[PDB]
């Protein structure tokens, strides 16, 4: 695989979750952004792949699984088989990466998106591969029990602009946030 993409929503303390869910009530526009970003492939007849941890998979309402129009891969050191609705189960990021290169897959897959949690983000960030990180910074603090790993500001350069990513601070339900994109070049 030539490059990875990661997408995350973070609040002020770099928190990404609480009690198995998100720290904030629903933001419509943030959500649509996530969907649009992870679903949109730039090649006819291909689909994007989403990789996520076990807890993240289970955080999705059951009736809503797997994320439509994407190949869902779940990572677990404990499961024997893919949880019901998931396309593939992998024992590590490496395995997942490998699988994707598999012939069966390689042809069917456009983009690879890492959708968390912590450990998954971390692993992906450490691979010495081209990587783009799409961060939504919510400019408020909510109680969180799960956090985003530390990003190496020497590797990941924040782009000042990116195609299709609004630049201004957004607002919704009295909350402000901004979209940011960082890029690591290998
Ligand atoms: N704000 C956001 O953008 C965002 C995005 C995602 C999730 N969230 C939130 O974060 C929480 C879930 O995140 P989390 O960090 O707690 O959990 P997680 O990464 O989704 O789940 C962890 C489990 O996943 C498996 N796993 C994780 N990384 C792995 C690796 N490299 N190789 C193999 N297995 C791996 C392990 O399963 P086994 O124990 O079976 O081995 C591990 O216990 C929820 O609150 C969710 O709502 C927020
Ligand atoms: Ca476990
Ligand atoms: Hg927070």
Which ligand 1 atom sits closest to the C-alpha of 91?
Answer: 33
Give dist(CA 35, CA 90) in Å, integer. Answer: 23
Ligand 1 pocket, 123 CB below 6 A? yes
Q: What is 131-143 written as a DSSP string?
A: EEEEEEEESS---
Q: How was this structure determined?
A: X-ray
Q: Is 180 a catalytic residue?
A: no
Determine phi and psi for 121, rounding to 5 degrees: -55, -50
**CA 12 to mean position of chain CA atoms:** 18
For the record, the structure tokens of 165 come out as 């990513």
What share of residues in the chain are helix, strand, coil (percent, to 5)? 25, 35, 45
What does the DSSP 8-state code read for residue 24?
S
Q: Is 30 a catalytic residue?
A: yes
Pairing of strands 3-10, 15-17: unpaired
Is the bond preceding 66 in cis, omega lying within 30 degrees of 0?
yes
Structural domains for the chain: 1-186 (3.40.430.10)
Mutate to test the pocket of ligand 1, among 10, 60, 75 (most ligand atoms within 8 A of CB): 75
The resolution of the experimental structure, rounded to one decimal in Å, is 2.4
Is 56 one of the annotated binding-site residues?
A: yes
The Cα-based distances of 48 to 14, 152, 175 in angstroms read 26, 26, 30
Is 29 one of the annotated binding-site residues?
A: no
Helix (H) or strand (E) holding 179: strand 175-184
In sequence order, what are the beta bridge partners of 18? 21
Q: What is the dihedral of CA 42, 6, 16, 87, to 10 degrees?
A: 70
Q: What is 80-108 written as a DSSP string?
A: SSPPTT-SEEESSHHHHHHHHHSHHHHTT
3-state secondary structure of 127: coil
Nearest CA to ligand 1 atom 37: 76
Nearest CA to ligand 1 atom 41: 77
């Amino acid at each position: 695989v030539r490059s990875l993409n990661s997408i995350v929503a973070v609040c002020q303390n770099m928190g990404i979750g609480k009690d198995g869910n998100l720290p904030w009530p629903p933001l419509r526009n943030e959500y649509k952004y996530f969907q649009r970003m992870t679903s949109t492939s730039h090649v006819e007849g291909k689909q994007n792949a989403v990789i996520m941890g076990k807890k993240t998979w289970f955080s999705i309402p059951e009736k809503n699984r797997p994320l439509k129009d994407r190949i869902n891969i779940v990572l677990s050191r404990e499961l024997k088989e893919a949880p019901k609705g998931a396309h593939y189960l992998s024992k590590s990021l490496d395995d997942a990466l490998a699988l994707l290169d598999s012939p069966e897959l390689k042809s069917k897959v456009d983009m690879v998106w890492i959708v968390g949690g912590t450990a998954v983000y971390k692993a992906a960030m450490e691979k010495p591969i081209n990587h783009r990180l799409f961060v939504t910074r919510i400019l408020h603090e909510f109680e969180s029990d799960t956090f985003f790993p530390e990003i190496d500001y020497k590797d990941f350069k924040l782009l000042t602009e990116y195609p299709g990513v609004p630049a201004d601070i957004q607002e919704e339900d009295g909350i402000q946030y901004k979209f940011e994109v960082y890029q690591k070049s290998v």
